[PDB]
Each structure stands twice: as C-alpha cells, then as structure tokens.
Coordinates of C-alpha atoms and ligand atoms in Angstrom, one line a residue:
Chain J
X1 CA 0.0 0.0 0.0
X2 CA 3.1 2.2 0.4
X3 CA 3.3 4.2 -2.4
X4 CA 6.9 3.9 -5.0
X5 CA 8.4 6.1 -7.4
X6 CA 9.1 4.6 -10.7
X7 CA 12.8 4.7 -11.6
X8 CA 12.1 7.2 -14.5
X9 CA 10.4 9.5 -11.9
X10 CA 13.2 8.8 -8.6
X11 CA 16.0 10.0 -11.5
X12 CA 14.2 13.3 -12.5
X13 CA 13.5 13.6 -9.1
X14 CA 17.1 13.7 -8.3
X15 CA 17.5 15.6 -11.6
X16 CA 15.1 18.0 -10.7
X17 CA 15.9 19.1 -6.7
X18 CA 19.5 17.9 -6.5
X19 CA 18.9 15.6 -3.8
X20 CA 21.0 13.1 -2.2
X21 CA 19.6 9.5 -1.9
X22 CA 19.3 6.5 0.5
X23 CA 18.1 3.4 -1.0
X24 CA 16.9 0.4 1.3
X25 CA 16.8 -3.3 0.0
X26 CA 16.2 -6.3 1.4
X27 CA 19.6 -6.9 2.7
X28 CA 18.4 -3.8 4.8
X29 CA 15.2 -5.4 5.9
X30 CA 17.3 -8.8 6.3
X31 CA 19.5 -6.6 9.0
X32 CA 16.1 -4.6 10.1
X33 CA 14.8 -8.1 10.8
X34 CA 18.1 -9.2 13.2
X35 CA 19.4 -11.2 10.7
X36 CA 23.1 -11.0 9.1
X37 CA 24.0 -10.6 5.3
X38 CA 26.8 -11.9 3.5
X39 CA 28.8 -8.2 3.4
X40 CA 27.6 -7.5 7.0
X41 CA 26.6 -9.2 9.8
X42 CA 24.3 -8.5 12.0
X43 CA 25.0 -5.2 14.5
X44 CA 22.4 -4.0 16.9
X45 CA 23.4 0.1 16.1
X46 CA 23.4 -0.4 12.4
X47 CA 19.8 -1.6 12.4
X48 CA 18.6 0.9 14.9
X49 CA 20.2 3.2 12.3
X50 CA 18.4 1.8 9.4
X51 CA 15.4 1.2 11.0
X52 CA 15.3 4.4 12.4
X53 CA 16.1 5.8 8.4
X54 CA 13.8 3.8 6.5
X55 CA 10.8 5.5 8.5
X56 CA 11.8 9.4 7.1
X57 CA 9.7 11.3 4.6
X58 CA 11.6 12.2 1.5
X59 CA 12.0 16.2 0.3
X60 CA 14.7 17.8 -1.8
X61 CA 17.6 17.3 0.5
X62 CA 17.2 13.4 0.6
X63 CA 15.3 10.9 -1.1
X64 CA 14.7 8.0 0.8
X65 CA 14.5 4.5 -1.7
X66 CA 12.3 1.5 -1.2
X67 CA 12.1 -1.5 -3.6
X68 CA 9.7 -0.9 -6.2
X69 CA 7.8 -4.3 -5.2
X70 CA 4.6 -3.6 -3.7
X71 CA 2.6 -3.8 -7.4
X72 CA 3.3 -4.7 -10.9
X73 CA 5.8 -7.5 -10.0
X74 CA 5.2 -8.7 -13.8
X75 CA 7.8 -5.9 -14.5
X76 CA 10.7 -7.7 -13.0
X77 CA 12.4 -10.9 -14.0
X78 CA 10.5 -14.6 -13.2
X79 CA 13.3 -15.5 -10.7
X80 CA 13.2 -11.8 -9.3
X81 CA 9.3 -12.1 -9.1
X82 CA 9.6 -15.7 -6.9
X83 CA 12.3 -13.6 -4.7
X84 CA 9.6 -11.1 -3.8
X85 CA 6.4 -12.4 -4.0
X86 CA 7.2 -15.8 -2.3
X87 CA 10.1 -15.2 0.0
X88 CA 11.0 -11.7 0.6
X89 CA 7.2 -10.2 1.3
X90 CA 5.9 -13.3 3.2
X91 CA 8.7 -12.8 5.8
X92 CA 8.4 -8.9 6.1
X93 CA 5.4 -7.1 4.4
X94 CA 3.9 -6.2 7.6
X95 CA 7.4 -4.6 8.8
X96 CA 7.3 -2.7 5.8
X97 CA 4.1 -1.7 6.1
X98 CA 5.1 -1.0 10.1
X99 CA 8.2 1.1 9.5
X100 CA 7.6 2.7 6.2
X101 CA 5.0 5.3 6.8
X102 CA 6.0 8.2 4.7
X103 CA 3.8 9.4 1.9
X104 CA 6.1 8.1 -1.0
X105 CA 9.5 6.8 -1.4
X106 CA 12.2 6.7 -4.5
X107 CA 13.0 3.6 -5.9
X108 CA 16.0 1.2 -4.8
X109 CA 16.2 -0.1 -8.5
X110 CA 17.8 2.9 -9.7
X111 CA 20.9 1.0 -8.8
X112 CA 19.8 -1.8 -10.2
X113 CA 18.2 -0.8 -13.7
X114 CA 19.1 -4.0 -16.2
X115 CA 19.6 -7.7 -15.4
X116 CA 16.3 -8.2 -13.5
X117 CA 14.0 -6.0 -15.4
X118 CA 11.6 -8.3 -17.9
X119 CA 11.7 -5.4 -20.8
X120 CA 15.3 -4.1 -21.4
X121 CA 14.3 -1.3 -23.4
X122 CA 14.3 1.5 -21.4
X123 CA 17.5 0.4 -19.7
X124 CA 20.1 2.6 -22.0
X125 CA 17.8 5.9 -20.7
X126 CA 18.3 4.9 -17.1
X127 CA 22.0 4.7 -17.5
X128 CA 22.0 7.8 -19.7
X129 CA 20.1 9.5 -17.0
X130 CA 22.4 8.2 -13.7
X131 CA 25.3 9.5 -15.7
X132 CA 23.7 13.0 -15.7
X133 CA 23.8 13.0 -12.3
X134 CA 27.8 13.0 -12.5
X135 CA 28.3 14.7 -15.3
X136 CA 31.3 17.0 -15.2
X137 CA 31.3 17.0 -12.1
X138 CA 34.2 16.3 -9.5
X139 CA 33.3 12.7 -7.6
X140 CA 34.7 10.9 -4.3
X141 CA 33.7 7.6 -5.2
X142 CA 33.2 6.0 -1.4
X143 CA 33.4 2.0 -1.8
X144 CA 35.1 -1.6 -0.6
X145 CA 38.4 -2.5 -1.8
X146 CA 36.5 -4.7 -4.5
X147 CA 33.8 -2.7 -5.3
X148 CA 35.7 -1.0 -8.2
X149 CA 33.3 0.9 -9.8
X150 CA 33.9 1.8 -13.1
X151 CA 37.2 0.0 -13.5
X152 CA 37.3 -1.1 -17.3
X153 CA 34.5 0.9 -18.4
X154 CA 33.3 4.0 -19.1
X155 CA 30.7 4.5 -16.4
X156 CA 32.8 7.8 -15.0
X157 CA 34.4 9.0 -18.2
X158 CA 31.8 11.9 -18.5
X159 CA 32.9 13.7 -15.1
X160 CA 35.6 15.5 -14.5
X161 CA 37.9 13.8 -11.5
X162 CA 37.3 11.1 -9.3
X163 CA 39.0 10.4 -6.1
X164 CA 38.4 7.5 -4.1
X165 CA 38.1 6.2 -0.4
X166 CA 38.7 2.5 -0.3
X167 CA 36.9 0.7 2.6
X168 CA 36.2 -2.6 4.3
X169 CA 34.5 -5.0 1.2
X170 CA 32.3 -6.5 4.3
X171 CA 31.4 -5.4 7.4
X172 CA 32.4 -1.9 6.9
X173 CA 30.3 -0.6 9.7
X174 CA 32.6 -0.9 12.2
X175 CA 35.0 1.4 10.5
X176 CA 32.1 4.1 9.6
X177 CA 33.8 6.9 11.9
X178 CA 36.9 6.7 10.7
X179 CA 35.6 6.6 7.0
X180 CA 33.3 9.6 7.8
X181 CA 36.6 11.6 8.9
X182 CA 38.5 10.7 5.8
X183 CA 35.4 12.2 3.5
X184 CA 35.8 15.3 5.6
X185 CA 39.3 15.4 4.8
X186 CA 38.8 15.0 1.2
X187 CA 35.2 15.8 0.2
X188 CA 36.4 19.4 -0.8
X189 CA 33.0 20.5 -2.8
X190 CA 33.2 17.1 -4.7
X191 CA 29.9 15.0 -5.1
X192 CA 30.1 12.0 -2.9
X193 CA 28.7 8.3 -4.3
X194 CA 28.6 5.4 -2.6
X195 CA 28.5 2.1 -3.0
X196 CA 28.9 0.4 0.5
X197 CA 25.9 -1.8 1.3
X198 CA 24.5 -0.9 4.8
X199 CA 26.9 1.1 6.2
X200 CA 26.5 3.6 3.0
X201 CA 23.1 4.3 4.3
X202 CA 24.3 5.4 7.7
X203 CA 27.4 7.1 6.2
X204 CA 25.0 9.3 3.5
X205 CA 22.4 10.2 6.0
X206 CA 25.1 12.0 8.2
X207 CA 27.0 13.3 5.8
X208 CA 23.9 14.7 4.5
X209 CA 23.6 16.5 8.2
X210 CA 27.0 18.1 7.7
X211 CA 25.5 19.5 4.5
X212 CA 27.5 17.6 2.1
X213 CA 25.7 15.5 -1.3
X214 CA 25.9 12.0 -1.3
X215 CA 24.0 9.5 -3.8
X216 CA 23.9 6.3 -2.6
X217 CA 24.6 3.9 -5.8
X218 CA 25.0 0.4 -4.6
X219 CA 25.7 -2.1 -7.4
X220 CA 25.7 0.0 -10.8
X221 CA 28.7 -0.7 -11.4
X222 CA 27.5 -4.6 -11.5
X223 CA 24.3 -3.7 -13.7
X224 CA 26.3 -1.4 -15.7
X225 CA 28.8 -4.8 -16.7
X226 CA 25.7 -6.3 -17.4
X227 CA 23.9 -4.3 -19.3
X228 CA 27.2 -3.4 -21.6
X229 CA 27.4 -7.4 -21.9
X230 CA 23.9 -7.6 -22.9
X231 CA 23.6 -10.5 -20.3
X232 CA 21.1 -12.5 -19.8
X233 CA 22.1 -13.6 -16.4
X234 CA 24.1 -12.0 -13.2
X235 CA 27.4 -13.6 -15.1
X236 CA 30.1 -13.6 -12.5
X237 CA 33.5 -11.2 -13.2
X238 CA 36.9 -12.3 -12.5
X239 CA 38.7 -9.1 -11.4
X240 CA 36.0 -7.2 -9.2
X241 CA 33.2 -7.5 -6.9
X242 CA 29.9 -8.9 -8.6
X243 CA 26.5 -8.1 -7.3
X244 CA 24.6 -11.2 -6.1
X245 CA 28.1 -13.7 -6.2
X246 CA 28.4 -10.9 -2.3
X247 CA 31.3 -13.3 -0.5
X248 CA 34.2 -12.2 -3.0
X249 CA 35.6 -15.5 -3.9
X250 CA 37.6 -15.9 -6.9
X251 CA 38.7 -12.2 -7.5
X252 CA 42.0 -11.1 -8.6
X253 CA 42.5 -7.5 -9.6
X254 CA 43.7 -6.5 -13.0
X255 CA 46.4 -3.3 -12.8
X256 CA 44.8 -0.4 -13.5
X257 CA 46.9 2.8 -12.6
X258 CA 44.1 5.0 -13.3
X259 CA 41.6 3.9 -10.2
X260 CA 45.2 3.3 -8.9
X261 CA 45.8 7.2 -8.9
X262 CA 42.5 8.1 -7.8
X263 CA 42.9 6.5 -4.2
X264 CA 43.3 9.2 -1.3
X265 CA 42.9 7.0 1.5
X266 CA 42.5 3.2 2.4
X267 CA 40.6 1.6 5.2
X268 CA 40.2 -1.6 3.8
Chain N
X1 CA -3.3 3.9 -38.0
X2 CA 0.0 5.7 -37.5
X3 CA 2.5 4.5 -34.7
X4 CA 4.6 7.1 -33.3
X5 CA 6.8 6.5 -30.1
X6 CA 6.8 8.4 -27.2
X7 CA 9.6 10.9 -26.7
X8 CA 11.1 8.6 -24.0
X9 CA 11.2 5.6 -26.6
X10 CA 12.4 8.0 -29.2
X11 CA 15.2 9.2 -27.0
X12 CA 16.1 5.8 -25.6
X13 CA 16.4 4.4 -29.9
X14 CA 19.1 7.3 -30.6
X15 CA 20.8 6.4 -27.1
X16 CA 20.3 2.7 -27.9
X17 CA 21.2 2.7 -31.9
X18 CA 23.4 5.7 -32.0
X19 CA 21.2 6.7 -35.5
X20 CA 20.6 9.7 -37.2
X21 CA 16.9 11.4 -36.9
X22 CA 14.8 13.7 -38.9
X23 CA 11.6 14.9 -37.7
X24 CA 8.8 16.5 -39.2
X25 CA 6.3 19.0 -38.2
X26 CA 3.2 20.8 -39.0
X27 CA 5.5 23.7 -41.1
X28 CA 6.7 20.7 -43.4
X29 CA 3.5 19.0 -44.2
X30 CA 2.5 22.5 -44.6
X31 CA 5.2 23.1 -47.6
X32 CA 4.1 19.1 -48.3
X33 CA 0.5 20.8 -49.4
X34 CA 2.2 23.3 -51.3
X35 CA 2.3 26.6 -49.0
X36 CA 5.0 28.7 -47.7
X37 CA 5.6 28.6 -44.2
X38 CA 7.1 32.0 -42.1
X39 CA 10.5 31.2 -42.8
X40 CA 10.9 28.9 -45.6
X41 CA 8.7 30.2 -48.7
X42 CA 7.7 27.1 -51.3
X43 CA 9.6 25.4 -53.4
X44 CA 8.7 23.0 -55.4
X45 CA 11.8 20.3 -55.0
X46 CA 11.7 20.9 -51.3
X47 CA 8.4 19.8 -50.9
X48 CA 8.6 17.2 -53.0
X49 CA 11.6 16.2 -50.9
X50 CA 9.9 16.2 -48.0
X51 CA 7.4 14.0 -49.1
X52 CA 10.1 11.2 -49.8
X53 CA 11.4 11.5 -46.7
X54 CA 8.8 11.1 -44.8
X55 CA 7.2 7.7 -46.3
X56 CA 10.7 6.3 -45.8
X57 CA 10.8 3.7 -42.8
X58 CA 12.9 4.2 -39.9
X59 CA 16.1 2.0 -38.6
X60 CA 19.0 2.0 -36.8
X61 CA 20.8 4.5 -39.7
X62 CA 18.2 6.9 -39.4
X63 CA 15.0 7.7 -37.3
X64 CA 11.9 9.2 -38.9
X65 CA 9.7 11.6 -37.1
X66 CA 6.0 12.8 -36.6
X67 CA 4.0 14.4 -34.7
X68 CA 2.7 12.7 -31.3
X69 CA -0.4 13.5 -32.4
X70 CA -2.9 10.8 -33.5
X71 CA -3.6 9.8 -30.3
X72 CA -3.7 11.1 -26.6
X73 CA -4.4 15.0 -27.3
X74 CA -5.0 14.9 -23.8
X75 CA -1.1 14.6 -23.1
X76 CA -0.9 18.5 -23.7
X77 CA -1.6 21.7 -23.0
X78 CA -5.6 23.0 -24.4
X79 CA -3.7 25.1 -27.0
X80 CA -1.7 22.5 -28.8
X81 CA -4.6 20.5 -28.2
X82 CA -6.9 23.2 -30.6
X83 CA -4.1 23.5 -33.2
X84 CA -3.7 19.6 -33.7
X85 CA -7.4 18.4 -33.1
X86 CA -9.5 21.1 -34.6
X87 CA -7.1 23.4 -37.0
X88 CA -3.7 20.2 -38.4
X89 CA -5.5 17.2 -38.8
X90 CA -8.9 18.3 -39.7
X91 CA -6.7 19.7 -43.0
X92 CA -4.0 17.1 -43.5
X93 CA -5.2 13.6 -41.9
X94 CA -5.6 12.4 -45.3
X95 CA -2.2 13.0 -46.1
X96 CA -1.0 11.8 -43.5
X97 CA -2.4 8.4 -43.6
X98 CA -1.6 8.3 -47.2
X99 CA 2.3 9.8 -47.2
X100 CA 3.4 8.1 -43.9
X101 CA 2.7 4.4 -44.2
X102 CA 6.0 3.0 -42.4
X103 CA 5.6 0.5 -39.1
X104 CA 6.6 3.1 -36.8
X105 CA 7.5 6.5 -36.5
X106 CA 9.9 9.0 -33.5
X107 CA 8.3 11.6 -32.1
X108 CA 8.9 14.9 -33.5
X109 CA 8.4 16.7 -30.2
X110 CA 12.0 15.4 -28.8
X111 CA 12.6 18.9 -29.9
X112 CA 9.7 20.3 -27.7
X113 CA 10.0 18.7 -24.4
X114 CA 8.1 21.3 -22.6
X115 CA 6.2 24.3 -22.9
X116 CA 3.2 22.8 -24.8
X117 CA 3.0 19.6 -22.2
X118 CA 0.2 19.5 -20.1
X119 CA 2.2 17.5 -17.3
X120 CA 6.1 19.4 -16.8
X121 CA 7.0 16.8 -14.3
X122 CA 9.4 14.7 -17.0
X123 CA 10.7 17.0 -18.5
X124 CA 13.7 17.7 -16.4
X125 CA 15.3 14.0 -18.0
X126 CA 13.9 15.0 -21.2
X127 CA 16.4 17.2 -21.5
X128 CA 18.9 14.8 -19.5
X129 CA 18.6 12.4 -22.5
X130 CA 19.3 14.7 -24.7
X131 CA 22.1 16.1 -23.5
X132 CA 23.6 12.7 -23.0
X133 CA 23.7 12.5 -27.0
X134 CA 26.2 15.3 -27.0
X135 CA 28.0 15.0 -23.9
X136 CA 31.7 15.1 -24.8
X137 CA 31.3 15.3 -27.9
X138 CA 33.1 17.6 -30.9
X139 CA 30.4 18.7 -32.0
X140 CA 29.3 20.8 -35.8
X141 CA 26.4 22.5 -35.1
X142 CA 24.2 24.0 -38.4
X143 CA 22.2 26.5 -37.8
X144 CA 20.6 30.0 -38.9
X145 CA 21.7 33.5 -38.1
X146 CA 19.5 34.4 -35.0
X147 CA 19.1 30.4 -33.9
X148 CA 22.3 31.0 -31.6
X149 CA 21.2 27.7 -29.7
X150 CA 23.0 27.6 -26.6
X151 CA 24.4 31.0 -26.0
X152 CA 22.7 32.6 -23.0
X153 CA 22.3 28.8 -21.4
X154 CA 24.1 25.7 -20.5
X155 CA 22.5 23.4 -23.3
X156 CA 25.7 22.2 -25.1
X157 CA 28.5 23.1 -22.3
X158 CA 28.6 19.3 -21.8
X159 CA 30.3 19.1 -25.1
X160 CA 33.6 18.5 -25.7
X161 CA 34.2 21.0 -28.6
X162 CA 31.5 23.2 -30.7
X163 CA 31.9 24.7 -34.2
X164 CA 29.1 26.3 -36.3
X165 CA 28.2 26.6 -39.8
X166 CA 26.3 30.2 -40.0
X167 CA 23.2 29.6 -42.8
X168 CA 20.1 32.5 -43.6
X169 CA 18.0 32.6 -40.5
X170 CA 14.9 31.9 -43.9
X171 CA 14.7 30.4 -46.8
X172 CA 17.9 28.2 -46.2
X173 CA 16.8 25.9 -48.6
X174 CA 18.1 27.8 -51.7
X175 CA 21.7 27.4 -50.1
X176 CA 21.6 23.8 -49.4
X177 CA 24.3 22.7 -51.4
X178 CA 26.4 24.9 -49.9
X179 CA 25.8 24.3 -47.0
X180 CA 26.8 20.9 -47.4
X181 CA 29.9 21.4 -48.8
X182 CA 30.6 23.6 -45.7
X183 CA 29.4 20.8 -43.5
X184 CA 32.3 18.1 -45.5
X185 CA 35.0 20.8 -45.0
X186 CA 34.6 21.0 -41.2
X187 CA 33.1 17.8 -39.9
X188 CA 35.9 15.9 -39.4
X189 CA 34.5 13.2 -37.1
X190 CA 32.2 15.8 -35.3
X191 CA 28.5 14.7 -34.0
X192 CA 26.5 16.9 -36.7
X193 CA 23.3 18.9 -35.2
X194 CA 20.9 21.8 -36.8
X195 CA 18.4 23.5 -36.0
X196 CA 17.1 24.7 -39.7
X197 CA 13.5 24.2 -40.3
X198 CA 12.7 22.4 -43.7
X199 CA 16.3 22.7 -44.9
X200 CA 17.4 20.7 -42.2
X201 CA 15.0 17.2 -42.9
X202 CA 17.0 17.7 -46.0
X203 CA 20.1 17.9 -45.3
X204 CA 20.0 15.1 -42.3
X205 CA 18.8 13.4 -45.0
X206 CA 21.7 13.6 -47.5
X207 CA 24.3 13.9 -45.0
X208 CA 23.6 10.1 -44.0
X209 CA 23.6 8.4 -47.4
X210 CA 27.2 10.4 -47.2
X211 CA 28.1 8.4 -44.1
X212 CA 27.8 10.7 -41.6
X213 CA 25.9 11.3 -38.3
X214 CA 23.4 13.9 -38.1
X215 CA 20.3 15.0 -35.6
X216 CA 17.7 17.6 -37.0
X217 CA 16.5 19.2 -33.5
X218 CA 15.0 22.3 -34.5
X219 CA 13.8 24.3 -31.7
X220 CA 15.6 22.4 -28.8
X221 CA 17.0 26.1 -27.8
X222 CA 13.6 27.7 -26.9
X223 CA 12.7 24.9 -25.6
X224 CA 15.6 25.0 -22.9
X225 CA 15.1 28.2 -22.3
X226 CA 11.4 28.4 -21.5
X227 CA 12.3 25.5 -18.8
X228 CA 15.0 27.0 -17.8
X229 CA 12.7 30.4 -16.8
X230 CA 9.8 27.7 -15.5
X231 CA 7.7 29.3 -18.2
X232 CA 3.9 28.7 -18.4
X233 CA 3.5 30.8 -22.0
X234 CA 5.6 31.3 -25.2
X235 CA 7.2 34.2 -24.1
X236 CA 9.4 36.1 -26.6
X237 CA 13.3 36.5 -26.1
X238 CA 14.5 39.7 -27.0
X239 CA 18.2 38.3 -28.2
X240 CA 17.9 35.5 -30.8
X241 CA 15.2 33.5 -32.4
X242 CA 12.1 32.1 -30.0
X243 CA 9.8 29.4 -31.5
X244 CA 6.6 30.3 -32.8
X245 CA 7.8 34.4 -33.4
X246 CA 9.0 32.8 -36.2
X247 CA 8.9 36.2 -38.4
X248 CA 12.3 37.3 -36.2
X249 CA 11.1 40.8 -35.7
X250 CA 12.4 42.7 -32.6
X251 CA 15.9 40.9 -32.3
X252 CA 19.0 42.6 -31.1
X253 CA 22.3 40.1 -30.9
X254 CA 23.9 39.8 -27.1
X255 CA 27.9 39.8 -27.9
X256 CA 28.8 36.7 -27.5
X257 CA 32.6 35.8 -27.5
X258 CA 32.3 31.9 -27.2
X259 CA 29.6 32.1 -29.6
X260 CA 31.9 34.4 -32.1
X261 CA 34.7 31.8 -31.6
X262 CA 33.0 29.1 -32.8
X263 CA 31.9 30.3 -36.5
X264 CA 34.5 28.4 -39.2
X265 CA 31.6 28.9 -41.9
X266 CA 29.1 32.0 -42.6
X267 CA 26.3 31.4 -45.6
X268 CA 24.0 33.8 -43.4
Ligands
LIG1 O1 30.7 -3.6 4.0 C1 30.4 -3.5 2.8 C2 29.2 -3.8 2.2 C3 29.0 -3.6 0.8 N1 30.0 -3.2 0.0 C4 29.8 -2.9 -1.4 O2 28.5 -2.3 -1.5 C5 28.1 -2.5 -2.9 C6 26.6 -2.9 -2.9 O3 25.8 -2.0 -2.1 P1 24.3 -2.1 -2.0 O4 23.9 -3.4 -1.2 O5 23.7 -0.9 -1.5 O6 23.8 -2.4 -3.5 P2 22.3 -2.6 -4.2 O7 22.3 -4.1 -4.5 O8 21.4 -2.2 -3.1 O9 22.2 -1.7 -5.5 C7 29.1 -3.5 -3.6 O10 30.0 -2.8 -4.4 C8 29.8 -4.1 -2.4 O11 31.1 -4.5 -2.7 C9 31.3 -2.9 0.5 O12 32.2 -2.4 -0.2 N2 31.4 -3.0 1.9
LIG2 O1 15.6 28.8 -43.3 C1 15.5 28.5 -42.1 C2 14.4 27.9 -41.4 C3 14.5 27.7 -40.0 N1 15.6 28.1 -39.3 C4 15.7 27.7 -37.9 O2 15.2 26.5 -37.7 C5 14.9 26.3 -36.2 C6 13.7 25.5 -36.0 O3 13.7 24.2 -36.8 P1 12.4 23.3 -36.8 O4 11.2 24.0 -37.6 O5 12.8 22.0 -37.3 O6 11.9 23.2 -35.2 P2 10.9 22.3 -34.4 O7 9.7 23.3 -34.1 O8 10.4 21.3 -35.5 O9 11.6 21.6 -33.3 C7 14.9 27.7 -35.7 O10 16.1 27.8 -34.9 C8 14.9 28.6 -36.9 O11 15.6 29.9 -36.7 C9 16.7 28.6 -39.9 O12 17.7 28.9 -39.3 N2 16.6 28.8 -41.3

C-alpha cells in the first residue's frame, strides 16, 4: 500500500531538486529483521540506524529508496518475481508496512536498472540519466576494496575527477567513523557516491547532516557490466566484486593505474 | 493507423542505436500541401523532398519523425490540443495516412519537451537524454543567423568541442548545397546537429547516405530556455530567435565571444 516512485520519476527527481539519496533493500530489511547478510553481519546500532532511516519522509535534501515491489511485479524478471512475492514479502510485508509510513519513497532499482528487469528497453535511458547526475562534475567515489566501480568501463568517463576512499569489502560498519573523517578530509565540494551496502546508508544520511551530497549507488557498477554485456544472467566477473556472487571469492584485480591514482585513503 | 513513439522511446532508440533522426512537423506538411511557411517560402523540390522522406521507414541508420499526435491530445496543454485536433488534422489527416505508411515512426516533439506539455514533471530528463547524445562530444552544429542555440544557457557546455556553420535565419533551402559542402569541409569526425527548419530534414537526409551522423532538433533552444525560466506561456526572447515568433522581428544580438569563436563557416 506504500506508495513507490518509478525509476524514471526517482531519477528526474534527483535531476530535478539535487537531492542526495538512501536506498533500502532487502539486505536492509534482512538486518532490520536481526538477521546477518553476506557483506555485514548482524549489528544492533546499524539496524537501529536503518530502521530508524527507512521510516523518514523524503524532500529535496534526501530521497529515501524503497524496492519498487509492492505492485506490478510482472515488470521484473521470473526469478526476481519468486524472490519477492514468495520469499522476501511473506517474511516482512507487515514490517514494511510498520516502519515505512512516509507518503512516497524513491525507488532502490535505480541501482539496479538491467539484469532483472523483464523489458530491457528502457535500460540505456536509465544509465543515460544516472550518468547525468555525474556529469562533469568532481566525484569521491566512497566503496570496498573490491567494489571497483567503473574500473574497465566508461561508467565515470563523462565527469571531470574522481578520487576514491577504499573501505572494508564486508562489514564496513565498524570502521564508519573513521571513514566519515576521511570524507571530511577529502570531500572538498566534490559529489560524494557510494557504494557500501549498509553502512553507506548510515554514512550518507550523516554526511547529508553536515550539508554535504551523497547519492547512494550500490551495485551500478555490476548492472552497468551487465547491461554493456547484454547478459542474460548476473554472469560472475573475475577481477571485481559482482553483485549477487556478495562473499568475493575468486577475485583477482587486473592493474589499472588509473583507479590506482585516484585512491586518497585506504581503510580496507 | 499511425504508430509514433513516445519521446522517451524515441530518445532511448538514438541512445540505444546511436542513429541519425529527422523529424517533421506541422511547417513541413504545410510546404508538403504546397504553401510557404514564415521562414521557408515554397519550393517546389523541397516539398517534394519532404514527401520522400517522410514515407521512408525508420532503422537503426536513421530515425523518422511525426507528430505525437494521432492519439492522446489529452497529453498537452488546451492550446496545442486546438491546433492539432480542430485546426492540423482536420486539413492534413488524409495526407497523413496516405504519405506516412512505415511501421513506426519517432516523435517529432523530442525537440519540444516542454512548454506545450500539459504535465512538466518529466521534463527535467527530457532534456537529460538529450544532452547525454552530446555529452563530450566535438560537436558541428548547423544553424541559422538568430538560432544562436546555446548562448545565454548551458545546453551544449557538456560538449567537448563546438563549431558552427552560420546559414540564412529563412529560406535556407536555396543554399543547401552549400551548405553541405561547408558541412564536408569542417566535420571531421564531429557529432552533426541543426536547427534549420525544412532545410534541415534535407540535409540530415543527404548527409547520411554520405556516411555521416546527423540529428535535426530544431527548436531544442527555446525549448531549454522556456524551462530553464519555468515558463507557463511562449514568451518572446529579445536576443535571438524564439519558437513560434517565427517572423524574427524585434531581435537585437547579445555579444557573444564563445559564440563568435566558434563560427569556421558563414552562408547567413
Ligand atoms: O561492507 C560493505 C558492504 C558492501 N560493500 C559494497 O557495496 C556495494 C553494494 O551496495 P548495495 O547493497 O547498497 O547495492 P544494491 O544491490 O542495493 O544496489 C558493492 O559494491 C559491495 O562491494 C562494501 O564495499 N562493503
Ligand atoms: O531557413 C531557415 C528555417 C528555419 N531556421 C531555424 O530552424 C529552427 C527550427 O527548426 P524546426 O522547424 O525543425 O523546429 P521544431 O519546431 O520542428 O523543433 C529555428 O532555430 C529557426 O531559426 C533557420 O535557421 N533557417
């Protein structure tokens, strides 16, 4: 009954106001519900925090994200529409509909805008529309030492310098005030993007107290693989993180002396 | 009947296919029925050309445009809704139906993605798509003498590089060969754009069986700019061509350095 933006209207939204962005998906519920995910386990103050986010009304300072589930689930892939409507919203429907009060939410698929959407079409203008939001602009890409967005594609090409803080690949939480000091110390007037599962949710809500903007991103950089490959399924890569294959096995990092150059700290 | 995409799908084929587009308007089939239009007066093999090109089907090489208009009046504002329903297709349906008889057909209004739609909201990644076809891009921009799209705004300042080809403000038409042998002389390898009326369905046209790249998108300029002021009415600008004042009366150049600096050709 809780009412979701499309992803067409969450990225003119963002387009539109400038907004930073929290999106919460099911590994946040999974958390919400006491129960660990393979990137973070289980911590008391990080679900407080997320449960304590998920329930804010969204204006034109932060957008708060939801999975775009509650209807039309013949929009999404057959093994994405079992995941929700036979595993996910059995479990946790009536915490969503406990917590999650606000009068409308963005979507968490604007992260996730290829692989598990039943009609492709549309997915070049989503992409074309995220990278607008980047566009010649200078970035502090904030991510785990695997995440390596945009390494050996062109995701990034269209702004105009990216530095990077590399953090903990899982359970980055517990490092969260130590990464928050090193975005102080580099942020300068740059436009901060995540991609940090839970502990990116935390880390842009406060940063968006201390007036900086932060979109919270997640796994483009997976769907963005994908969608270049014109996969049909969440095919596994051999030199960076892969959304959906979360414990990081069978990874080994090709030399790239451009993301190289781009690193200002490293809390991995 | 007639299908015509939306300018979302429209946008998302030139994203998608990387093809050329030509789109036409009420002003061609206007010159299709034999009459002048404000600033292109008859002429026979122009209209006669126009006619060809618009029963030709479209593909990844080259996108042909109509109006959005044979369906779903109700999509804009009660003015274009009067023009189209009671004053365009009363007149030229016929035509219409017997000129245009491809499978499908892009939307001429990905040129005018505002002023005359009823709902604003999606704008705002109209223009985002859009400007993702140009985005670091060397760009060879054709236009007329008081077109001057971009100067006063931040249209193209996502390109890489701009140069322009100066042609008459009217009646272009009678210069077309010239103008295309200004166009080979400076291209290069430059994304080709104009804003030229009749001329430019022409010249889109010829420029692709040539090899090259080319997107007719007329009035994009007003267009901007009337978003860009949150506009409710056609207002006129004082310093360069405005859609639908189409006569040009009342225009007194800004000085425009950048603008200046970009001329290598002038057939004005
Ligand atoms: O402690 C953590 C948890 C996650 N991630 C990264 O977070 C991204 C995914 O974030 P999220 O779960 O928000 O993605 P979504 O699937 O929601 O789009 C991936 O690049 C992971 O490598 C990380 O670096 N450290
Ligand atoms: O001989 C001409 C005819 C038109 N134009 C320009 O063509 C543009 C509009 O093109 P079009 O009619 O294709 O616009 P649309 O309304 O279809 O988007 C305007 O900038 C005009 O100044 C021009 O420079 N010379």
């Amino acid at each position: 009954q809780i009412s979701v933006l499309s992803i067409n209207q969450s990225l003119d939204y963002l387009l539109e106001k400038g907004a930073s962005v929290v999106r919460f998906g099911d590994g946040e519920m999974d958390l919400v519900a006491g129960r660990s995910i393979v990137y973070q386990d289980f911590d008391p103050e990080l679900s407080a925090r997320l449960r304590e986010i998920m329930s804010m009304e969204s204006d034109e300072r932060l957008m708060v994200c939801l999975p775009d589930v509650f209807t039309g689930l013949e929009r999404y892939s057959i093994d994405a529409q079992n995941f929700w409507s036979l595993n996910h919203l059995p479990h946790f429907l009536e915490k969503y509909k406990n917590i999650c009060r606000a009068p409308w939410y963005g979507s968490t698929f604007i992260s996730r805008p290829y692989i598990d959407l039943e009609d492709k079409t549309p997915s070049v203008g989503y992409f074309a529309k995220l990278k607008q939001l980047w566009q010649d602009k200078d970035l502090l890409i904030v991510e785990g030492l695997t995440s390596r967005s945009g390494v050996g594609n062109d995701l990034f090409d269209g702004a105009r310098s990216i530095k990077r803080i590399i953090c903990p690949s899982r359970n980055a939480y517990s490092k969260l005030e130590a990464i928050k000091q090193a975005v102080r110390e580099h942020a300068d007037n740059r436009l901060i993007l995540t991609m940090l599962g839970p502990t990116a949710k935390v880390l842009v809500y406060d940063l968006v107290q201390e007036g900086y903007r932060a979109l919270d991103i997640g796994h483009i950089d997976s769907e963005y693989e994908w969608f270049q490959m014109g996969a049909s399924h969440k095919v596994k890569l051999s030199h960076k993180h892969t959304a959906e294959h979360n414990f990081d096995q069978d990874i080994e990092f090709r030399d790239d002396q451009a993301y190289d150059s781009q690193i200002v700290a490293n809390l991995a």
